[PDB]
């Protein structure tokens, strides 16, 4: 047998406009039992996944049936932006959920943060945070 040492390592409804969020959560026992933060993350805006999905899917405009986007976009029916913090509660974590460029049949952003201050450990205990939101559409042409 060969072991080694055990290491010491809200459903918002935004109506097609800008918004905000705030996250200060004490699910951060991943280095020395939730002492403090490694380094900050001052209000990271999440709208870039659905920007670079909702732009080129309707800028496909090649033959759309052969699916050069060949993998299924069932995991792109949410957003799941990420904030992997560097080497108590969550110090700074805000996100401007801007629905002003968004689809009409999506639900959430399962936002996963790699909580560890673990220098190249390949170990980082990533805890995910959901939203389970709903969109009330205001206008169509």
């Amino acid at each position: 047998s060969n072991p080694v040492e055990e290491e010491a390592e809200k459903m918002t409804r935004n109506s097609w406009m800008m918004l905000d969020g705030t996250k200060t959560d004490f699910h951060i026992t991943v280095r020395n039992k939730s002492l403090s933060c490694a380094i900050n993350h001052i209000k990271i805006i999440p709208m870039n996944n659905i920007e670079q999905m909702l732009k080129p899917d309707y800028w496909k405009k090649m033959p759309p049936d052969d699916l050069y986007i060949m993998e299924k976009q069932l995991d792109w029916l949410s957003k799941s932006c990420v904030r992997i913090i560097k080497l108590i509660t969550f110090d700074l974590e805000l996100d401007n959920t801007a629905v002003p460029f968004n689809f009409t049949g999506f639900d959430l952003l399962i936002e996963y943060g790699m909580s560890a201050t673990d220098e190249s450990c390949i170990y980082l205990k990533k805890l995910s945070i959901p939203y389970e939101v709903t969109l009330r559409r205001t206008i169509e042409v």
């Binding site: 409804r13 004490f26 020395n32 009330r136």
Partner: protein
């Protein structure tokens, strides 16, 4: 057996949990050393508290108490510092450490050094308004936040349904004095008069068919806790249920 210590924890449910330790002078120990102190011509003790610290008991952790503290020394007294916990959801009783350092004193020397640490669990443990029929939960999206100044304002009754016939009901305010130990008659009359006459609800039988705005104007002052009157009514016989929630100072 020189300074009796106790920790009291109060559960503020709309915030963090608050727990305060409390030092005291332990009189059944003070008359002991008072006898030998007035034998050596001294009236009261001079115990010096030089390092007082509460640490979050874990594998290893520590906290910091929620105001400032110097390095103090008192004769026959009691002190009590407060440190904020984190309000747990269910079933995790946290523990703390609470170390201290009493330094006794004598004639400019002979400071008999003492130290103490009593580690224990910091769990004393003694706004959604549900429909109570079919989980049609209501919550104001800005409850208990309103400093109006006898101006108009708008609120947000975010109704959360079963999404099964979601268009059913109507709000109203009932500006009528309810018809009710003689000063127990008068306090109930002043409560029922200031409830039913102080605010107006400019959208009266608004007939909501899942947000709302509900503009009020509010023509008298005073802290209106719990905002009574603002009833709803639904498709069945009498779902006359309250909101029971939200408050507004009007000055």
């Amino acid at each position: 057996l020189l300074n009796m210590r106790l920790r009291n924890i109060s559960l503020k449910s709309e915030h963090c949990i608050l727990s305060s330790l409390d030092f005291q002078t332990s009189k059944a120990s003070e008359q002991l050393t008072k006898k030998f102190i007035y034998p050596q011509e001294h009236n009261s003790f001079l115990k010096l508290n030089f390092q007082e610290i509460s640490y979050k008991l874990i594998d290893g952790t520590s906290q910091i108490e929620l105001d400032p503290i110097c390095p103090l020394k008192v004769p026959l007294t009691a002190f009590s510092y407060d440190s904020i916990s984190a309000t747990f959801k269910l079933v995790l009783l946290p523990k703390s450490t609470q170390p201290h350092r009493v330094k006794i004193t004598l004639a400019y020397e002979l400071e008999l050094h003492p130290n103490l640490k009593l580690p224990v669990r910091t769990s004393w443990e003694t706004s959604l308004v549900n429909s109570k029929l079919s989980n049609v939960k209501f919550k104001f999206i800005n409850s208990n936040i309103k400093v109006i100044k006898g101006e108009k304002f708008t609120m947000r009754l975010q109704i959360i349904n079963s999404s099964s016939s979601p268009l059913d009901l109507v709000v109203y305010y009932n500006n009528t004095i309810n018809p009710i130990t003689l000063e127990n008659q008068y306090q109930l009359h002043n409560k029922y008069r200031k409830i039913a006459e102080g605010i107006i609800l400019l959208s009266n039988d608004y007939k909501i068919p899942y947000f709302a705005d509900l503009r009020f104007i509010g023509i008298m002052s005073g802290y209106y806790g719990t905002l009574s009157g603002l009833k709803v009514l639904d498709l069945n016989t009498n779902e006359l249920i309250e909101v029971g929630n939200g408050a507004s100072v009007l000055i």
